[PDB]
Amino acid sequence: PKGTFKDYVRDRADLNKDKPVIPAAALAGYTGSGPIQLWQFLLELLTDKSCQSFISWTGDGWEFKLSDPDEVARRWGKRKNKPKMNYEKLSRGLRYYYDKNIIHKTAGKRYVYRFVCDLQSLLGYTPEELHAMLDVKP
Amino acid sequence: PKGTFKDYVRDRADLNKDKPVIPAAALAGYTGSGPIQLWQFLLELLTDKSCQSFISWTGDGWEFKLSDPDEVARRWGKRKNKPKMNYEKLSRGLRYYYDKNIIHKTAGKRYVYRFVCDLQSLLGYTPEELHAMLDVKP
Secondary structure: OOOOHHHHHHHHHHOOOOOOOOOHHHHHHHHOOOOOOHHHHHHHHHOOHHHOOOOEEOOOOOEEEOOOHHHHHHHHHHHHOOOOOOHHHHHHHHHHHHHOOOEEEOOOOOOEEEEOOOHHHHHOOOHHHHHHHOOOOO | OOOOHHHHHHHHHOOOOOOOOOOHHHHHHHHOOOOOOHHHHHHHHHOOHHHOOOOEEOOOOOEEEOOOHHHHHHHHHHHHOOOOOOHHHHHHHHHHHHHOOOEEEOOOOOOEEEEOOOHHHHHOOOHHHHHHHOOOOO
16 A cells, blocks of 8 residues: 555554453453354444543443444444444444343443443453543543 | 453463464565465464474474374364365375476375475574474474
8 A cells, every 4th residue: 555564554543543441352252152243343332442432431330322323333343244234233232232231221321331241340441440540631 | 151262372382282383374475475375274284383293393304294184184174164174185285286287196105205395495494493492492
């Protein structure tokens, strides 16, 4: 392409990309879920500094917000090779996690959710630790 | 719950896994190649310290050896969700790269090939540079 592959990688690194704390494929392998799942993908985006403009931790425990839900849906589609992925499907996926108690929606607010499963024990990180590593303001 | 995700990751790191100098996905993205191609996959394995037992650089420029061709094929099939992938198909794939001048086979030797496209200009790395980062004996 333009410059060398080395340039490409350096440019991505400079933009804080390709180094999520919790890579979805890695978490899928660890949990043995086979295919990558939406909740694991959201976790990767939330621990990827380059993604903070469209999805981020609110600073309240495991609560997060979708600043650009369409972008989130777009990336999800690309990751699962489903070009037809959209916000309608993304929201349906999120509602599915309600009864599964993986993700709950924050009442009286919009596009704000919270992981309600025990991620601290599963992941080995506290909300504080993760927020420091990602330099989250709140 | 065999440890935490964090332990799972450190365990793999202690085995020199998950850190290829040239990830196939990244290379495909940079070249705008779409799906990951076999030659890109070989480059990934060749720059992944954890794969040296079945595929490695010979120490002569961009020449490499498939010490365990069957395992290489298995990993390729696994990466592309192609369960039928095996040595016969992998070898067919390699031969296809001949007239495409991407990879040529070293005559007179067994399981030895060489990238013949200009990888130095494409990657930004010299063979010797990669060899050093990978502790190639030779």
